[PDB]
């Protein structure tokens, strides 16, 4: 018989299976479509999620009730030191899809990226790329022949780049290595741009500007094994239910005589790969700027970090990206930032934001001061101050 009353399905059938992600680094499934007539540029950048804060802004949306009025908004800080380009990969079109033709590497690789090729670095002889380095030392002619191959045959060119994880407070010493696609120009221009950046640093401000709408790819917070009530949001059974109530009462009809894939079941929750789009860039701060957290209206000589540090992360001492709202992942998680895959002309996409104030009170409790100086001014001298 039919359901007595109608209700929408619990959970989405498009995020299946609800399993653990295959890798902790989130991969870019698709890159922005290439436009030959643009300047040669990177399409993505890797950073580390540091924490969240609060900002104040004036809204510019005519017709809104909050137009020309202050709004308070959550925002996320991504620690983004510059990346180092260490290689290049060429891809050829085939009737079976993109196939990588060859990979060319820079002459010198820093210890933090070479740690990525090891499970037991302290017990190894550190031989990675040691014979490859001699392909440059003689006359580099083999390297140039490989790059000529990429120019002749590739249709898609991506650069190999790694984070400088030792500029973050993370105790992990392995750097994160990723392929970032080069868009714009001819294939030959792409290879030349990759070559001139071998061993060089590329900064966030060259990929992402301020007011841009960008996407974040990351693995979500893990929760382990979870029951259906919280994993899928199903209704709790009545209090007097024998053998428990955090369940789905009927997991299927008699026929088909099999449990259907569409039925909510207990299993692993969180730690999923997600691609979230349309997060506005509120700031591209600079690590050398000693007033990262200051605005035009709030002139206090202040960094983006909250008093006491970001909880369970540390201090953000590099370039950073302040993003509107929340993004997938937890503190310390490597996040991949990607350019938008489409052109957006709506007000929210084209609005220019001007920050009034950024919060820097402690995230470790009910912080009521923005600065040590303000704390001292409010409380006066203390016993430990003599």
């Amino acid at each position: 018989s039919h359901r007595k009353y109608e209700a929408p399905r619990h959970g989405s059938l498009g995020f299946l299976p609800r399993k653990r992600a295959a890798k902790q680094r989130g991969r870019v499934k698709s890159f922005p479509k290439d436009v030959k007539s643009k300047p040669v540029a990177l399409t993505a950048f890797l950073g580390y999620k540091a924490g969240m804060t609060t900002i104040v802004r004036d809204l510019d949306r005519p017709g809104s009730k909050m137009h020309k009025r202050e709004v308070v908004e959550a925002a996320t800080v991504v620690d983004t030191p510059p990346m180092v380009v260490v290689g290049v990969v060429g891809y050829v079109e085939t009737p079976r899809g993109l196939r990588s033709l060859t990979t060319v590497w820079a002459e010198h690789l820093s210890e933090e990226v070479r740690r990525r090729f090891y499970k037991n670095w302290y017990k190894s002889k550190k031989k990675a790329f040691t014979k490859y380095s001699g392909k440059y030392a003689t006359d580099a002619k083999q390297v140039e022949t490989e790059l000529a191959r990429i120019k002749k045959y590739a249709s898609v060119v991506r650069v190999l780049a790694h984070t400088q994880i030792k500029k973050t407070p993370l105790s992990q010493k392995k750097a994160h290595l990723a392929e970032i696609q080069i868009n714009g120009g001819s294939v030959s221009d792409k290879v030349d741009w990759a070559k001139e950046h071998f061993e060089k640093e590329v900064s966030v401000d060259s990929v992402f500007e301020q007011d841009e709408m960008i996407d974040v790819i990351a693995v979500t917070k893990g929760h382990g094994f979870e029951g259906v009530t919280h994993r899928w949001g199903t209704k709790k059974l009545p209090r007097k239910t024998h053998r428990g109530l955090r369940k789905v009462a009927c997991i299927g009809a008699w026929h088909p005589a099999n449990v259907n894939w569409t039925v909510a079941r207990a299993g692993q929750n969180g730690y999923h790969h997600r691609t979230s789009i349309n997060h506005k860039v509120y700031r591209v701060g600079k690590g050398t700027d000693e007033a990262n957290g200051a605005t035009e209206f709030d002139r206090t000589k202040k960094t983006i970090n909250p008093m006491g540090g970001f909880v369970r992360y540390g201090n953000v001492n590099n370039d950073f990206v302040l993003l509107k709202g929340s993004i997938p992942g937890v503190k310390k998680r490597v996040v991949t930032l990607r350019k938008s895959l489409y052109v957006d002309t709506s007000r929210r996409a084209v609005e220019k934001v001007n920050l009034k104030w950024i919060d820097t009170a402690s995230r470790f409790g009910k912080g009521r001061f923005q600065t040590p100086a303000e704390k001292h001014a409010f409380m006066g001298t203390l016993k430990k101050d003599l």
């Binding site: 009353y5 109608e6 209700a7 609060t54 104040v56 009730k65 909050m66 009025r69 202050e70 709004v71 308070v72 908004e73 209704k235």
Partner: protein, 131 residues
């Protein structure tokens, strides 16, 4: 007429709020909320500025035993405005109105939430302090 942002709901069906005008009613019992769609087992619930369908449980006899519109003017469930302020009043209260949003009484006791007065000009006319 107007477009108020989503507010934390305070008064589900069955809630009894104070009646704040001088119509002679003392209570207002919520039995429906205008604009409530469909969702199995979810109670209709109102926030400040919402029109409800109400009866008068305690008040003048000629007002009782009848279904009438009413508008919520304040609530004690905290809600967050777009400026980041979480605020809340001491009690939940409403006023008896017309289907067109026009009050039945002529005076309002106590403060009126800014969202309600922005949405309802006739209540704003009879209001004193607006927060």
């Amino acid at each position: 007429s107007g477009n108020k942002f989503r507010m934390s709901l305070a008064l589900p069906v069955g809630a009894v709020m104070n009646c704040a005008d001088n119509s002679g009613a003392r209570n207002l019992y919520v039995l429906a909320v205008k604009g409530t769609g469909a969702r199995l087992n979810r109670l209709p619930a109102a926030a400040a500025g919402d029109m409800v369908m109400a009866t008068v449980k305690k008040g003048k006899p000629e007002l009782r035993k009848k279904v009438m519109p009413a508008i919520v003017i304040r609530q004690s469930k905290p809600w967050r405005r777009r400026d980041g302020v979480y605020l809340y009043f001491e009690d939940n209260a409403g006023v008896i109105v017309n289907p067109k949003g026009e009050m039945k009484g002529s005076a309002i006791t106590g403060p009126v939430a800014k969202e309600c007065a922005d949405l309802w000009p006739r209540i704003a006319s009879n209001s004193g302090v607006v927060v």
